[PDB]
Structure formats: C-alpha cells, structure tokens
Design a binder for this molecule. Structure first.
Ligand SMILES: Nc1ncnc2c1ncn2[C@@H]1O[C@H](COP(=O)(O)OP(=O)(O)O)[C@@H](O)[C@H]1O
Ligand SMILES: Nc1ncnc2c1ncn2[C@@H]1O[C@H](COP(=O)(O)OP(=O)(O)O)[C@@H](O)[C@H]1O
Ligand SMILES: Nc1ncnc2c1ncn2[C@@H]1O[C@H](COP(=O)(O)OP(=O)(O)O)[C@@H](O)[C@H]1O
Ligand SMILES: Nc1ncnc2c1ncn2[C@@H]1O[C@H](COP(=O)(O)OP(=O)(O)O)[C@@H](O)[C@H]1O
Lengths: 418, 422, 418, 418
C-alpha cells in the first residue's frame, strides 16, 4: 500500500459556490450582511455559527443539522461555509438523497462510500533519513557521499539489522546487497537492489490531506482508470472491496498511533433527505454515535412527506421521529429583490461576465419569479449571445433572448401542456 | 480487557429508581430523582412486584403516551429498581431494519444484550482516592502508601464521568471489565483513604451479557468499522459455542443467568414477524422483561391490512400490561428542565428557565433540552456571566422546532391574504 | 437415537385455563351450567360433545371445527376441553395465525412443527431383561448374581449371538468381553465393556407420552439448550432438519410395528384463522385427509375478512370456500353479568386471591364493558396493591386503583388521541 | 527449537580408558614413561604430541592420522589422549569400520552422524534480562518487584515493540497482555500470557558443551525415547531428517554470528579402517578439506589388505593411495612384561580390585601370551570368584580358575576344533 496519494474531488458540485469563503460572522457571532461571499440570510448563518461553535466544544453530542427551506435559499452554501468554519482543508461531501438509489449498489454502501469521502486524514510528518551504500559509518548515492558520525547506541541498533559494508540501508532519526556488485551470472532471485539515487541525504516534510475514499481508490489499482472513467469503465464497481477498506483502516490507525497523522471528520451534506428510507436513517443513527464521524447535515424543501419504508407514515420533511430528535433545525429564507441583485452581481463577477445594471435587474426579476438557480443559469448563455455580436458586455436584450431560448421547468411543462 | 454490563444512549443521568416508597409502593414526587407521573410509576412498581415471584407468566409491558413524557425515563427507572449489575438495553424499533444485519439477527443481539451471565472470578481491582482528572479533544489516584497516574480512552472516561466521579472521591476500578464503583468521599459518605497496595487481586462477581460474550469471542471490530463494508452480525458457530459453554457453566454452577430489561421505543414500527420473534422469546425461562413504548394512539399493524391501538397484533395486545403516561404540568416541566440543565453544566437565569418551561409546553421537552446547550454556547460567545432569557430567545429564533419548521417550509405557498385560496 | 425423552410444554398458553377440566356434559350429552370448570355456554359445549363423539366414531371424515365468536367468549377453553374429552394425555397445541409469520422460517414449516406438537405418542411396554456377565447359564452384576435355568430353545437362540463365558449379554423375554478382564496394555480399540451394574435383573415398565416434536428436540443435540434458550440461542433454528424428522418417523413406525407404542393424534387449535393465507389452507387441506392427523380447530372473531393470497376475495371469517366446506362451525356467545361473576370467582379461587363479593362485582362490570380477558387480568395487580396495605383481602378500592393504573387497549388508544 | 540440551555420550566405549588423562609429555614434547595414565609407548605418544602441536598451529592442512599396530597396543587410548591434549571438553567419537555396515542405513550416513558426534559446540553466554509485568518503567514478578531507571534511548527502543502498562516484556542488556487481567469469558485464542515467575530479575550464565548430534536428538522429539531405547524402539531411525539437520546448522551458525558460541571440531577415531570401502574414503576425503571438520584418526592391525570397492587392489592397511597420501602414519609397539604388569596394576587400581603381585604376574603372562585385552578382562571374574570365598583380595588361584572358566578366542576355536 502507498502513503502519498492523489485525490480527485467532485468539483462539479461546488462550481456554483466558489464565491462562498465562509459565514462572515463577527467576533460576537453576529452575521454581517454582504460579507465573506454571503448576502443576507443572517439568521441561518448565525445558527450555523452556533453549530460550528458547538462542534468545536464537543457539545454536539451525537446530533446533526437540518436545513429546511425553499429551492431559492442557500442550504448547500451554508453547509460549505460550515465546513469552512470548522478549520482548514476540512472534508466536505455534498450529495442528494436521489444518489443512494443505485442500480447494482445498495443504498447504505453508497452512504458508506460518501462517509469515507467525508472523513479526512491530515498528514504532517518531518521525515529525515540518510540512505545509501555503506562504505565504512558512511554512505554513498548516485552523485554524492557523506560520512556520518555514529554513537555506539545507533551502532548497537545496527547490530540487529542485516547491515554490512557495503549494503543499502535506511536510518530513522526522530524515532541487502547493492546493485554495483551484481554480476550477469546471478539473475533472479537476487539480493541485489539499486543504490539510493541521487541524494546521499533524504530529509523531506510530508504534508497532505486526503479522504479515506482517496486511499480506497489509490489502492484499487495493481493507470488511474477509476478516476479517469469512473462509471463508464464497467457496470459494477468491483474494485473497492471490504478487505481493501479494512486494510486501509488498519493502516490509518497505524499512522495515527505513531502520532504521524490525524484524521479529521468533515461535513456530510445530504440534500433531499425525504428521499431516504428507514434503513438509511438507521445507518445514519449508527453513524451519529461514532466519535470519529463527520457532522451530518440534512436538507429539505418539503414540509410534510411520507416516511419511505413506512406505511404512509407522513412526517416532518420525510424524516423519522427517532432521527429527527437528534437534529437542530435551521430555517432558510427566500430573498428580497435587492439581495438577488447582489448575489447575481457576485456571481457574474466570479464567472466572470461583464453585464449592465439593467441586465442585473432583468435577471433578478427571474430570480424572484422562478428560482434563483434558473436566473443564475441565464448568465452564460447571455454572455455567449452578446459575444456573438462582439458586444463583450451583456445587455438586457441578451438576457431576454436567453430567457426565451432556455425556459425553466414549470414554463416548459405548462407550455407543453398546450 | 473486556466489559461488564453497565454499559447501560444515556441522556437520562438523573434516574436511580421509580421514586417509590419501599413498602407502600407509593410514588413520592421528584425522588431518585424522576418527577411526576406518579400513576404510571406506581403502576410500574406494581408490575415489578408482579414480576418478583409473579403471577404475570412472561408478559410484555406496554407504556403508551404523548411524546416528551417519561415513559423512557420510567423504563430506566424500572431497570434501576432491579438494581445495578442487571442488563438493560434500549432500542428504537426502526433500528431493527438495516442492511448491516437481518431482523432476526438484530432482534437476537438486542435480546442477548438483555441477558447477563454472572460468575465469581478473580480480578485486579484498584481502590483509592482520586487526586486528578483531565480532559482532551489521565487519572491520578493515591493511597496512604502510594500514588499513581493511569491513562484511559473514551469508554473509561464515559464510564467514570457517568458515575459522577471528581477529585476527592474514593473509588474502585476493575482493570479487567472497567467497572468503576464510587465508594465514597474523603472530604467535602465520608470514608477514609484506603491503605496498602493500590492494586489488589480480589475474587469479585462478574456479570456479562450474552451478546458481549459473543463479541469478545469474535474477531474484534476493526477501526472505522461503521464506515467500512464490514457488517455487524455474529457467526452462528461462535453463538453455539457460547451457548454451550454457558449451559455447561449453569449445569456446573459456575455461572448464574440473570435476565434483564429490553426496551423498544416507538414499538409501532415493528412488523408481524418481529412480534412473532418477541412472543417466541417470552416463552423461554431466560427471557428478560420486554418493555415497549408508544407515541401513537391507533396505528396500522405492519405486515397486515388491519389497524389496532399502538400498532400491535390483537393476540399480542391481549398478553401485555399497559401503563399510560400523561402531559406534564408547568411545574414538573420547569423542574425536569432544571435537572437536565444542571447536568449540562448550564447556569440559567430564572427568567430563562421560565421561558424554557413555556417552550417546553409549546414544543416539548426534547426541544427545550436541545435549546439548553445552544443557549449555553450563545451565552459563551457573549462572554455572559450567566445564560439569561436573551440567549434562550435568540436560540429559539435560530433553531426552529418541527412545527414551526414545516410551517415555515409550507410558507413558500401561502393559503390566504384577504381570503382562503386553493 | 434415544427412546425415553423429556417434553417441554408451552404452559404459558394454558395458564388461564387451568380450571377447565372438561366440558361438563351429562350421559345424554347435555351441557350442565357451572360444571367441570365451565360456566354457561351450553350450546357450544354440547356441540363440542357432538364433535368428540364424532371423532370417537371415526365419522369425522376429514373434517375440522370452526369456533366463531367475540374476544370475550371461550374458544380456546373449548378446544382444550375437546382435547380433554378425547381421552387422557391427549396432545393439545394452541397457536395463533400470527405465529406462522416467522422471520426466517416459512409458514408451512411452522405449521409442520406445530403438527408435530399435535401428534402424540403413547408408550406402554413391560420390558423384562436379565443382564450381566456369563459365568456358566448364570449372570453377575456389580452386586448380585443369579442362575437362570435355560431351555434348549433359548440356548439354540444363543448359539447365534456372540455368546461365551463370560461376556456381557442381554435377554428378551416377551419377544463382547467384560471390563473385568481388561488389561492396561490393550487401550483402544477394545472389545471390553463394563459389567451391567448394579442389578443382575432388569424388569422395568416403560410408560410415557411424548409428541413428535419432543422426539425432534430430544435428538437435536449430540445440554438441552433449545429448551433452555429457544429463540435466544441463534437467529435461525438450524438444528431440526428433514433427515432428523424422517429418521424420527422411521423409528416411530418401527415402535408401532412391534405393538410397543401407539401414536395418538391430538388437537391442533389455530386462533386468528383469518391471518392464514391460501397456501397454509392448502397444507391444512392436505392434513385433513391424513388418517393419523390431529383434529384441526380454527377460531375467529371476524365476520367477513379478505382471503389472504387472493385478490380482495372477501369471505366468511377469512376462510377459503374450499376449506370452509370441511368445517363444522360452532358459535360462541357473550356472557351475562352473573356468568362473568361466576367465572371471576372461579379464577380468583384458582390464582388464588381472596376478594370481596363487591370486588367481584366491580371486576364483572369491567368484564361486561371491556373484554373478559382484561377484567381477568385486573386480579393480580389488585392483590398486590391490597397486600401492600397488608389487607390480604382484595377490596373494591384495590380493583379501582388497579383499573386506573392499567387501562385496556381501547381506553389507552382513545385517551392518547387526546 | 531449544537452546540448552542434554547429551548422552556412549561411555561404554571409553570404559577401559578411564585412567588415560593425557599423553604425559614434557615441555620439550618428550614422553615420560609411566605418566598421565600411559605406560611406555613413548614414540607413539611423542608423535601424537607433534600431531597436537600441528593442529594447534593450523599446519595440519587437510591431513589425518593413521595408527598402525597390533591388538595389544593402545591406539584408542592414544586417540583419546589426542582429544584430551587438544583442549578441554574436546569432542571424541570412537567407532569401528564395522559400524558403518548398517542394515537399513547407508554407510556415509552413519559416517555423517558420527561426524556430527565429532563436531562440538561450546556455549558461554552471560545473559542478563529483567522480565515481568510493566507497572510504570518498573516490573513485577510472582514474588518481587523492581523499578528500573530507563534512559530515553531504551525507551525509544521500547516505542518499537508492543509495550504498554502493563504487559509482559523482555530486556536485552549487553545487546502481550498479562494473565492477571484474563477473564473467564475470553478463552482462546487469547493474548494473555502468565507473569514471569518468580524472579523480577533474571541474570544467568549459559555454560554448555554439546555436539551437533546432541542438538539433532534434542530436536527429534515434539519423552527422550531415542536416548532411552535407541535401536530397540523401531527398525528404521526415521526421526533425524535432513531438514532437521539443516535447521540445526542454520541455528548454530546464527549462534556463532552473535559471538555467543564457538563450534570446536573434535577427534573422529575410526578403528578397522580396512573395513571401509572407496566411497567412504571419498566422503572422508571431502571431509578433510573442510576447515570446520574434526581431525580424523584411522587405525589398523592389518599390514596389507584388499581395498574394498576395488578389484582385489591390495594395499597398505586396506587404505587407498589417494587417501593414504594425506595421513601421518604412527606405529604402536607391543609391550614388555613389566609394562604389562604396570598397566594391569593401573587398571585393577581403577576398577578397583585388590590383588596380589603374584596375581598381577599371572595376569601379565596372559597379557604376553594372548592380547592385553583378554588379560585385562580376567580381572572382574577373578574378583567375583575371590569375593565368593570372601577373600576380598584376589589371588593366583582366582586368576587361574578365571582363565580356565573364560577362554580367549583362539583357545576356544582350536579346542572346539578337537
Ligand atoms: N445568502 C447567500 N449568499 C450567497 N450565495 C447564496 C445565498 N443564498 C443562495 N446562494 C446561492 O444560490 C444557490 C442556492 O442553492 P444551493 O446552495 O445549491 O442550495 P439550495 O437550493 O438547496 O438551498 C447557490 O448557487 C448559492 O451559492
Ligand atoms: N417524569 C419524569 N421524571 C423525570 N424526568 C423526566 C420525566 N419525564 C421526562 N423526563 C426527562 O425529560 C426528557 C424526556 O424524554 P423521554 O422521557 O425519553 O421521552 P419519551 O419517553 O416520550 O420518548 C428525558 O431527558 C427524560 O429523562
Ligand atoms: N364458559 C366458560 N367457562 C370457563 N371459562 C371460560 C368460559 N368462557 C370463557 N372462559 C375463560 O375466559 C377466557 C376466554 O378466552 P380464550 O379461552 O383464551 O379464547 P377466546 O377469547 O378466543 O374465546 C379464558 O381465560 C377462559 O378460561
Ligand atoms: N601405553 C599404554 N598406556 C595405558 N594404557 C594402555 C597403553 N597401551 C594400551 N593400553 C590399554 O590397553 C588397551 C589397548 O586397546 P585399545 O586402546 O582399545 O586399542 P587397540 O587395541 O586398537 O590398540 C586399552 O584398554 C588401553 O587403555
């Protein structure tokens, strides 16, 4: 198994929240309107601040967060900001309840995978080691040689290992014949291994932050295809196994025991919580008791929904009572036209497309009429249409034509009805 | 090491019994110290008297009542009336359904958590006066002869903090099971500091639930077991081994079987098959006391197309003893909330407590309890000397309750402004 | 396999019918009110008498009994009385339709098990055998020796077996080196077996009555755990197999062939018959044709119910027509207040708790209001409450407090609704 | 595999050489007549001294010794003395050429075994280790506890092993849960192992001298039967295998590498060398080249004998030329009557039987007539015959009767011819 690994984050899901840098709260935990990327929504932000302060004080005793609000509100952005306020490089795994319904994968296994995506691992290890072929005790590399002055202690600790002049060796500071003598008549099996190249000394600082899932996919190969063509390689993802994950966990705990790495539970955000059934909530309930579990943040845009897995047992947001008990519900409000104009201005300055104030107004009225998401979508097409004229500055006519070329869901549906 | 039976989540750290007169079986309010519900508590005491050399003949106990009422608290009280070192396992009904394990398996584990095996074996127990205790994201204890500093993980810290142990307490710690016992106090029961060796080997009584015995004699669940594909069911071979050895021990006389209490909350979530299992279990002599709780008046019998009170089969209903709980008067609410507050280390202003009592009236006890800690944190961010009414109001306007939640979400499509609209 | 076995009967189900000793019918088959434990219900009892007389005359040609009535009536007690009138030690297996719905057990397998519980086996065998080590022909035990005078016939029947002086032997009346010569140098495998101890003669009378299920669980072990911790030992009861039951049946028929034992089909009582589906009734229909099958007595408190396993095919008591055809329906009536007082008096004298007549009245009014079962339940709590005062005599106040401390189903439900 | 082993030496073969303590040579390597157990035979002794001095100077370059002489001479005693002069506890394996002719064992395998008997191993290791259950860093035994003051070095070397308070541990000076916490519910497999008892400290000096064959037979059991009933246990000795011996050699070289033990090549004495065939001499020739091989001392009482394995190729002492080349031949002379009297006196004083000088004379005349061995045999029977009379002092009449009761080989043969 390998230590240093790469990590492919699903940045397709945070593309509309690049402007969100935090919650924008004062020292007294009071939300500042138009600050740190957020515009208004002071109540929800302050509540999230209370949540973060609760997690930091370990007072969040097996509890989660529930974001209740309309499609126009910013639940996802709030979850992201929560992850951002919990520290630096804090894991954030956003999903929807519709994702657990996989074809040939059980729901709680998808949940398990995303939990692995929500549990991070911070590695900060100043590793110092002098390697090379022994010549005295001194060492030699491809280009470079050193003469180390060893105390009798290290030399009596050398008496243990298979050390003789001149083999290739390794030295731990804080805590095997060489290739040069290999003949053509030896072949394999051999005890010959190449001389450390090309530095006689090797003192590096290992700094990394990777999720458990990153370790899972890193040790799923014996080229990186799973990250290259994930779903498109084969119907069933038969690479990530139980034995694999258990070996990974064993290795991780081993790293922790040496005080090398510290795992950090991030934020698991689940949209469309009403889509989950009883068994999923059983799994989540089991997760909430775990001390090394990521904070769970559900979200919903439904007042009352039938509890899936129950005999038409309608309930709050489609959440079972036994699990709703352990949740702090935070309401998210719709936006005034001015707040929408502000948000649109922040987005278009981030995309970043240049547009008139009147265009901002025309977009904002769609932000009020239809959801905020649609009007935010209208940006790029209008930019393209304007650039077609070479205007390079998006105007009202552009947004108009864009809104007429790309309708929303309800408009399309009701027009199609006629 | 291993683990003894208590090990009894526990958000009810204020219950030592039913608050009931030993002879009269008469409930004294706010004793032991659970408040009110005198009728249901007395009924529970009567049931328990009907268990001791009982005419009850293996019946289940159904506690039904409105949410935010001490049916669970009363269940734990009944668990304490049998005394400590007696298995007590709680369980939401909806927990029975998962991918990790089958219904039969989950029910089996749940029942085997409620039946303890009690033996007499030697162990290295410690007995001494506590000097220091620390916190992290270590225990210092001395005797009249020596002083020592030990290390401990999450389980041990939980166990000691559950026993309300601080600096100055004379305690006993089993280094084999992790069973902590508070003997007394050396200053402000007044005991003197123990002498001689700190760690002594005594022949003590060890009770351990069947499920725990199964876990011990199984491959220890790896780190991050929940977040790996690894399930939680126990191999039949191991179970058979344990059952056989326990049977041999009972024949010999080495082990004595001690039944306990299994508590199933929102029991209306169970289907017919579950009740079949529970009924079949109640026939065995080793069966524990099965106490179920219900928040619903009439529910659908899951598995069939018939409806019944609390969602139980009629056959099952004819074999259960029903105890009913009632809404609390404002006084009882205030008292309960205050007890719950002093155990969360939250210093409240009288006005904040009263307001929290009203919140408890309108939304429920669980919600108010949830608001306590948030109020504490809001007061902390304020550098407030105490948690006043302002903090409670702020947390109330920040964290909504289910009613206001669904109301707020439904507010996206309002129904009237000048007239009803639909 | 072993002959003499023990039998654990589920006496938890007959605990409320200990007073029922029979039907209390005269020589002319007319029910006596208040006799043999029964109070009133003369019609149903007389009908049951007709049923018993029918079974005794083999006129019950593949037919069963159906008890239709309210929860207050005594169907179970009637079935028990039927079992009692069919002879002595007659098997009685009471179940409910809700029991066949097992988690990891198919319905008809539960039915099969209970059928095994409903088919008994009466063993009456005067076995006479003189055993011991041969010395002449005479025999010797641990303490005792005899000299038998054998006719040439038995001696020519001895010529067949491996008999010589002095081995350990066995002798059948109505129809192998000894341990004393075993050296230390022999070990195993050996032909040495202990001398019969400690009686030179062995004449015993085997008298027993055990169900097929008793034989099943007796041969399910290679300690008695299944009877100790039945459901609590393991999720799936994987001890009772098909091969086991077939071997058991083979052995049983072998016992019958020698005229040693006689199997006696008992009474299989099934409450909540409407809970059974079509397949179960197919199995039962298959059972009714068997000559060595127990009499089947279904029960119901529902007039018309949907036939389970059929497309909303509502029918009488949830019983299919094809199976309802073969049933003699016996109606069971509710009880007048005086009959309830009498029944309560019989119960409390059996429990046995001492109570006033006014207390009996107060219980009886609950017997009329709510079902008889609830008021019968009220006895023990009132006794406990009274004994608390040390009254040792249950009074009206006690029953009152008991009825206020332990509500019935409907009261609890409707109070909870408010 | 075990370190400390026992060693059963075939002392039946040295019973007639207990008086031989050395060669009895001066500082100038000149033999002293009647010294160190030897009587006369000064030439052979001086030659043996030259041999010993040659071996000590590593000048014995792949050469052996050949003792040529009559049956009366002392070749075996000379070989023993050679072993004695080569140091202390020096291995000595005396055999005859007739021993390699085994029934179901090949000759060179017998030779190999005896070579293992001729290669010794001297173990001198002052092992110091403090063991017990950790309590701080301190340790505890059954009765006794100590508190060791550890430097950070040893503590950082403890960081490597599975060490925690309080497990059972081990400590190397010059270079695991305890049983007290074991519950009844744990059984096996377990990590519980008993606390070191009953000394908190363990500092012992391992001093031993064992042959390779001793290690072979020590690791041939999984009771010591091979030493108990060697040939009498089973026809073929199928316990000492190749894998066994190779593992033994691996272990031995491991012990040598740590400077713990030093193997010492002893003396392999082979009487009746003419009995060996060409293949055996090939094996011996292969052995002579080995630097860690015991010195090989052949012996013969035949002038010219046919080389076994060759077409009637008569040669010196039945030794092939190719192997005779590498041998220093040492002649052993017969004894004068006075030397025989002296030797007899030394023997009888060692047995030890008391006899008159005239008896010594009468024995000595048999020492001249027949071989020395026969007359030396005559001692014990004469002692018994004398003690029969209770004389307790052996006289001439006793030796006479003994010599008439137990003839030699030639007398018996020629008398039997008549
Ligand atoms: N107060 C706010 N500050 C900044 N961006 C916001 C705010 N409210 C909403 N948004 C933006 O509008 C969109 C809201 O949708 P989203 O965050 O995905 O979650 P949801 O629609 O479930 O509440 C996002 O693109 C988010 O960045
Ligand atoms: N009568 C009571 N006496 C003491 N504490 C009580 C009482 N009723 C409720 N509580 C406490 O208030 C909270 C109410 O929760 P709980 O009793 O578990 O609700 P439910 O049983 O309805 O699910 C718990 O912390 C419980 O310990
Ligand atoms: N006529 C009767 N004589 C005696 N006991 C009766 C009579 N009728 C009812 N009972 C008693 O009342 C209860 C009736 O319920 P049960 O026999 O279990 O069947 P069910 O309620 O289905 O008819 C039992 O405890 C039974 O002993
Ligand atoms: N010079 C001597 N000094 C002491 N003992 C001798 C001497 N010569 C012979 N012997 C003894 O006489 C016997 C000689 O026979 P042995 O040593 O077995 O070998 P071999 O007969 O082959 O020369 C032994 O018992 C030996 O101890």
């Amino acid at each position: 198994q390998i230590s240093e690994v790469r990590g492919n984050t699903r940045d397709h899901r945070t593309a509309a929240h690049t402007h969100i840098k935090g919650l924008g709260l004062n020292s007294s935990g009071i939300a500042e309107k138009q600050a740190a990327g957020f515009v208004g929504q002071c109540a929800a932000r302050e509540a999230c601040g209370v949540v973060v302060d609760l997690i930091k004080a370990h007072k969040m005793a097996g509890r989660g967060v529930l974001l209740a609000g309309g499609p126009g509100t910013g639940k996802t952005a709030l979850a992201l900001a929560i992850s951002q306020e919990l520290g630096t490089k804090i894991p954030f795994c956003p999903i929807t309840g519709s994702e657990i319904y996989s074809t040939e994968v059980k729901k709680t296994e998808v949940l398990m995978e995303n939990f692995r995506r929500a549990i991070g691992l911070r590695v900060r290890e100043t590793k110092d080691v002098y390697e090379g072929e022994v010549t005295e005790i001194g060492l030699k590399s491809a280009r470079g040689q050193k003469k180390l002055r060893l105390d009798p202690s290290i030399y009596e600790a050398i008496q243990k290992e298979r050390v003789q002049v001149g083999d290739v060796i390794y030295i731990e500071t804080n805590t095997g014949r060489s290739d040069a003598y290999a003949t053509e008549f030896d072949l394999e099996a051999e005890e010959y291994v190449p001389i450390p190249k090309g530095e006689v000394h090797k003192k590096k600082e290992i700094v990394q932050d990777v999720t458990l899932h990153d370790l899972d996919v890193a040790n799923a190969r014996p080229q990186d295809i799973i990250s290259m063509m994930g779903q498109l390689m084969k119907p069933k993802m038969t690479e990530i196994t139980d034995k694999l994950r258990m070996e990974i966990n064993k290795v991780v705990q081993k790293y922790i025991n040496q005080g090398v790495a510290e795992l950090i539970p991030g934020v698991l955000f689940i949209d469309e919580a009403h889509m989950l059934d009883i068994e999923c909530f059983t799994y989540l309930n089991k997760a909430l008791e775990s001390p090394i579990a990521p904070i769970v943040v559900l979200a919903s845009n439904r007042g009352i929904a039938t509890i899936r897995g129950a005999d038409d047992l309608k309930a709050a947001h489609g959440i079972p009572p036994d699990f709703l008990q352990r949740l702090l519900i935070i309401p998210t409000h719709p936006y005034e036209p001015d707040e929408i104009r502000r948000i649109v201005r922040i987005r278009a300055q981030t995309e970043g497309v240049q547009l008139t104030d009147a265009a901002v107004d025309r977009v904002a009225e769609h932000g009020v009429r239809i959801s905020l998401r649609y009007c935010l979508q209208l940006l790029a097409p209008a930019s393209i249409l304007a650039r077609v004229n070479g205007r390079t500055q998006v105007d009202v006519q552009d947004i108009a034509e864009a809104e007429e070329l790309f309708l929303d869901a309800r408009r399309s549906a009701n027009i199609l009805t006629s | 090491s291993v683990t003894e039976t208590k090990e009894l989540i526990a958000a009810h750290s204020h219950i030592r019994g039913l608050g009931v007169d030993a002879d009269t079986l008469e409930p004294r309010p706010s004793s032991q110290g659970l408040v009110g519900q005198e009728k249901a508590r007395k009924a529970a005491a009567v049931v328990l008297e009907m268990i001791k050399q009982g005419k009850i003949a293996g019946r289940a106990v159904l506690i039904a009542g409105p949410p935010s009422t001490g049916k669970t608290a009363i269940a734990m009280g009944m668990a304490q009336s049998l005394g400590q070192d007696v298995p007590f396992t709680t369980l939401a009904a909806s927990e029975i359904f998962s991918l990790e394990m089958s219904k039969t398996e989950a029910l089996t584990q749940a029942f085997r958590k409620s039946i303890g095996v009690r033996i007499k074996e030697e162990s290295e127990i410690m007995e001494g006066e506590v000097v220091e205790i620390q916190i992290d994201r270590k225990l210092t204890i001395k005797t009249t002869d020596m002083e020592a500093i030990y290390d401990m993980g999450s389980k041990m810290i939980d166990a000691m903090t559950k026993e309300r142990v601080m600096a100055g307490d004379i305690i006993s710690i089993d280094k084999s099971s992790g069973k902590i016992t508070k003997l007394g106090r050396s200053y402000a029961k007044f005991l003197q500091c123990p002498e001689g060796e700190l760690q002594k080997r005594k022949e003590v009584v060890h009770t351990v639930s069947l499920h725990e015995i199964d876990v011990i004699n199984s491959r220890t669940q790896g780190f991050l077991a929940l977040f790996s594909g690894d399930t939680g069911e126990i191999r039949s071979e191991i179970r058979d081994q344990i059952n056989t050895k326990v049977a041999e021990w009972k024949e010999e006389g080495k082990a004595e079987i001690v039944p306990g209490v299994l508590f199933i909350d929102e029991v209306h979530m169970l289907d017919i098959e579950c009740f079949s299992y529970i009924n079949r279990a109640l026939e065995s002599d080793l069966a524990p006391i099965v106490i179920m709780a219900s928040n619903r008046g009439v529910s659908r019998i899951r598995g069939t197309d018939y409806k019944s009170p609390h969602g139980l089969p009629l056959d099952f209903l004819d074999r259960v003893v029903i105890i009913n709980t009632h809404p609390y008067t404002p006084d009882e609410l205030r008292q309960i909330l205050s007890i719950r507050a002093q155990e969360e280390e939250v210093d409240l202003t009288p006005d904040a407590l009263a307001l929290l009592t009203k919140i408890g009236q309108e939304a429920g006890l669980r919600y108010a309890s949830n608001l306590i800690t948030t109020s504490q944190l809001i007061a902390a961010k304020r550098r407030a000397k105490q948690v006043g009414v302002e903090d409670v109001q702020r947390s109330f306007k920040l964290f909504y309750d289910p009613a206001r939640s669904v109301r707020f979400v439904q507010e996206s499509e309002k129904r009237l402004i000048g007239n009803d609209g639909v």
